[PDB]
Design a binder for this molecule. Structure first.
Ligand SMILES: */C=C\C(=O)N1CCC(COCC(=O)N2CCN(c3nc(-c4cnc(N)nc4C(F)F)nc(N4CCOC[C@@H]4C)n3)CC2)CC1
Length: 853
């Protein structure tokens, strides 16, 4: 059992905690999860080794492609009569002489056709090759049309010219390890005949330093009124009381939970410690007998005396308030009925104006409240609503989940409900819908209609909604794990989104078990991941030192210390030669210390610089730069940049070229993160200072246009201006809709070619002062500003048509501890700025008026 021991050491390093901690967990659900998830592991491995080397090579090097092969009109127009010019590179002699061959080929050609044409053009002086992107580990291994590869479409939009390298397939396959996933060593009754009322005994409490407030909930809604116990003095926290609720035992839905908290009185009621318990365990058994639940500290800004959206389970730290409980015990062990009994009990238990009304209801947004009249209206028309599937969320919200009969009937309706878009299926995965059948339906919709591109695009939200799962073992987690173990690009960010939260002890168990399974089945990539981990490790340590020991020293003294520590051999091995967690296709070779530096003030961010060891680094970027910041929460930045990329995608696929810049930003831990470095970019303040009339002068705004004209002389000029306008327009709309924090001359940046973008998104959801610089680069009363206002109006409209998607994305992110996103009241800001309750012309006038100010 030696290979097993080495693998366990490596998984422990990668996860942070040792694997033997899991073994000591005497929880049946934990060991059952650990064993049962290996089925998904094995499915994924078998799919990897399914087709000899190619299957593995595409697991490790998946195609980075757009979901649709179709080209937007403006993207196709940029082609030369529908064709693209491409440079294919070949390394010939052992001296690595690079020889280039330029081709003009149809944009929809397959990599095989490109290789054929390249060899034809080369010999004018079989299928044993593959195409690599020059300068990074990205391959074109699949028979997609060239233009559908994200890199190629990017080259077509940016006017750059694609530079690919031809590579013998055997050279790549020889670099693929013979992955051996080894099986771990830890693998080898009534049915609500109880026609009664649910009652629970609160026994006593320990580690208390008042009354107990309890309730029965289904997600966020309460199935009956809350029940306060007898106010007892905190000296003797002993109640031994029986609480009876207005709920019949068989009326409890599958996902019924008990939410309790301990409260104090001054008059002034204050929560002290909260807790939540699954009324049914993972085996469908209705809990009975005694139960000790260790409670959790209250989160900041808690409205009520109960935390029902909080995670379920006993606090791992057992030296906390421990509440003792007793659940009724009946004839035998009680279990939730089988779907067959459900169908039996369901089978046992219309005007055109009304149809148009149902359609209009379905059209509304998620946050739009539905009236009780509308709820009963949707319910009385629950069979017609199967013709308009998207209305399913709202319909679900109209169910009385405290009634066995209605729950069974909705179950039947779901067993045959038509599939809906993934965008709309995700909404059914947030905290509003805990019912396992609805969640299964949403996961099935994702599994059938979600390409890996879109899966990557929404991976952060999917990982988040994981936390809303009632049990370790569920369909959503199995789906994500299988996609992660069959596509390494997805598995990279899967692993990192999970690890970045391992510090959160409310999700440590779930995410730790998940990471254990993943790392066990992920293959050789584990080693690579481990390297990344260690690197971050070192960085954190270093930065920690800088923020305490050498906290109050001068820039040059801190710089001397950083160059000293950075030069320690244990440190240099750790931070040289590994993959960029921001993008694993990017190798990071040796550190260029002469180029690393501490970034102005802040939490003392590190600006690091690596050589790019790619054989042809020069044709992409010879130096990669990243900002490691050990100070502030980056989750707000991640969500903002994801939304910006989604908005740019909408505008492109709709026909308005507003080039945004959603640069990379990855949260890797508790307030530790990485940020991409956009080359050839400067803040507006840097522009005004470099252009400062001189030493002892003001810094007027009129100089930005001069700086751009100096950096873009000749025919370039107009181009640059255009770029600047469009990007600017885009970001304006973006920042107005999301309500981003205070902008200023150092929050905004421009590149040497005119592109403008924003950075550091502190707070969102709680008016863009177009400088004279912006308006004069665009030129007040000019055709340029007319086109500018038209762009902005069109972009506002375009983003208003997808309001549901952004509202759902935020709703799903609510689960995260993100401060700027604690309640639906913060999200409502988007419903406000996009004028959802108003009409289209009304919202257009609203935006025009907001933009006049
Ligand atoms: C005229 C003399 C004078 O007074 N000077 C002081 C002002 C100049 C420097 O002013 C600020 C500045 O240039 N930089 C600080 C900001 N920085 C930056 N930050 C970030 C970023 C994003 N998010 C978060 N959470 N933190 C941070 C970071 F500040 F730590 N990102 C970037 N990136 C974004 C991607 O593209 C590149 C860019 C570097 N940059 C830039 C430097 C000097 C003269």
């Amino acid at each position: 059992n030696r290979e097993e021991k080495i693998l366990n050491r490596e998984i422990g390093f990668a996860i942070g905690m040792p694997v033997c901690e899991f073994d000591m967990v005497k929880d049946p659900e934990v060991q059952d999860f650990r064993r049962n998830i290996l089925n998904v592991c094995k499915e994924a491995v078998d799919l990897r080794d399914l087709n000899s080397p190619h299957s593995r090579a595409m697991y490790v090097y998946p195609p980075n492609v757009e979901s649709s092969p179709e080209l937007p009109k403006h993207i196709y127009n940029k082609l030369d009569k529908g064709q693209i010019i491409v440079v294919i590179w070949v390394i010939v002699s052992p001296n690595n002489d690079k020889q280039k061959y330029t081709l003009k080929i149809n944009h929809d050609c397959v990599p095989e056709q490109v290789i054929a044409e390249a060899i034809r053009k080369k010999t004018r002086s079989q299928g044993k090759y593959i195409l690599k992107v020059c300068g990074c580990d990205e391959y074109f291994l699949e028979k997609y049309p060239l233009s559908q590869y994200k890199y190629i479409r990017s080259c077509i939009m940016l006017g750059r010219m694609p530079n690919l390298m031809l590579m013998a397939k055997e050279s790549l396959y020889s670099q693929l390890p013979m992955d051996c996933f080894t099986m771990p060593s830890y693998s080898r009754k009534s049915l609500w005949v109880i026609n009664s009322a649910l009652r629970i005994k609160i026994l006593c409490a320990t580690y208390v330093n008042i009354y107990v407030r309890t309730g029965i909930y289904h997600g966020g809604e309460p199935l009956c009124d809350n029940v306060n116990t007898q106010r007892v003095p905190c000296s003797n926290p002993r109640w031994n009381e029986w609480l009876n609720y207005d709920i019949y035992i068989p009326d409890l839905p599958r996902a019924a939970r008990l939410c309790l908290s301990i409260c104090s009185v001054k008059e002034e009621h204050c929560p002290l410690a909260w807790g939540n318990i699954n009324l049914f365990d993972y085996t469908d058994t209705l809990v009975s007998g005694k139960m000790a639940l260790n409670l959790w500290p209250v989160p900041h800004g808690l409205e009520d005396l109960l935390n029902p959206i909080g995670v379920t389970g006993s606090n791992p730290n057992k030296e906390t308030p421990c509440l003792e409980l007793e659940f009724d015990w009946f004839s035998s062990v009680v279990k939730f009925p089988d779907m067959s009994v459900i169908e039996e009990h369901a089978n046992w238990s219309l005007r055109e104006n009304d149809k148009e009304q149902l359609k209009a209801i379905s059209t509304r947004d998620p946050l739009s409240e539905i009236t009780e009249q509308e709820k009963d209206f949707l319910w009385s028309h629950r069979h017609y609503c199967v013709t308009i599937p998207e209305i399913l969320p709202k319909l679900l919200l109209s169910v009385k989940w405290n009634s066995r009969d209605e729950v069974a009937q909705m179950y039947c309706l779901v067993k045959d409900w038509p599939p809906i878009k993934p965008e709309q299926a995700m909404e059914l995965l947030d905290c509003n819908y805990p019912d396992p059948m609805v969640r299964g339906f949403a996961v099935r919709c994702l599994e059938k209609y979600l390409t890996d591109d879109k899966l990557s695009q929404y991976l952060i939200q999917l990982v988040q909604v994981l936390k809303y799962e009632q049990y370790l073992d569920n369909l959503l987690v199995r789906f994500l794990l299988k996609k992660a173990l069959t596509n390494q690009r997805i598995g990279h960010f899967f692993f990192w989104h999970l690890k970045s939260e391992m510090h959160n002890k409310t999700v440590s168990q779930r995410f730790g078990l998940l990471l254990e399974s993943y790392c066990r089945a992920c293959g050789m990539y584990l080693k690579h991941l481990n390297r990344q981990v260690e690197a971050m490790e070192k960085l954190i340590n270093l930065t920690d030192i800088l923020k305490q020991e050498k906290k109050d020293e001068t820039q040059k003294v801190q710089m001397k210390f950083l160059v000293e520590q950075m030069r320690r051999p244990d440190f240099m091995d750790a931070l040289q030669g590994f993959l960029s967690p921001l993008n694993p296709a990017h190798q990071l070779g040796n550190l260029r210390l002469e180029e690393c530096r501490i970034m102005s003030s802040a939490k003392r961010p590190l600006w690091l610089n690596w050589e790019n060891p790619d054989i042809m680094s020069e044709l992409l970027f010879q130096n990669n730069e990243i900002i490691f910041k050990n100070g502030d929460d980056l989750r707000q930045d991640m969500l903002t940049l994801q939304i910006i990329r989604i908005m740019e995608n909408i505008w492109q696929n709709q026909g308005l070229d507003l080039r945004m810049l959603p640069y990379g930003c990855l949260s890797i831990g508790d307030c530790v993160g990485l940020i991409e470095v956009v080359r050839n970019s400067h803040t507006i303040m840097q522009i005004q200072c470099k252009g400062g009339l001189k030493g002892a002068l003001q810094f007027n705004s009129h100089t930005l246009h001069q700086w751009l004209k100096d950096k873009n002389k000749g025919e370039i000029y107009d181009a640059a201006i255009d770029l600047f306008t469009r990007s600017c327009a885009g970001y304006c709309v973006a920042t107005f809709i999301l309500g981003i924090g205070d902008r200023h001359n150092s929050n905004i940046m421009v590149k040497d070619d005119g592109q403008l973008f924003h950075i550091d998104f502190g707070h969102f959801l709680d008016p863009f002062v177009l400088t004279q610089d912006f308006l004069i680069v665009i030129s007040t009363k000019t055709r340029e500003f007319e086109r500018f206002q038209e762009m902005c109006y069109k972009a506002y409209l375009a983003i208003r048509q997808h309001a549901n998607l952004f509202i759902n994305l935020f709703s799903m992110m609510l689960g995260s501890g993100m401060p700027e996103l604690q309640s639906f009241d913060d999200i409502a800001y988007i419903r406000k700025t996009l004028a959802l309750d108003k009409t289209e012309q009304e919202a257009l006038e609203y935006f025009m008026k907001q933009m006049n100010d």
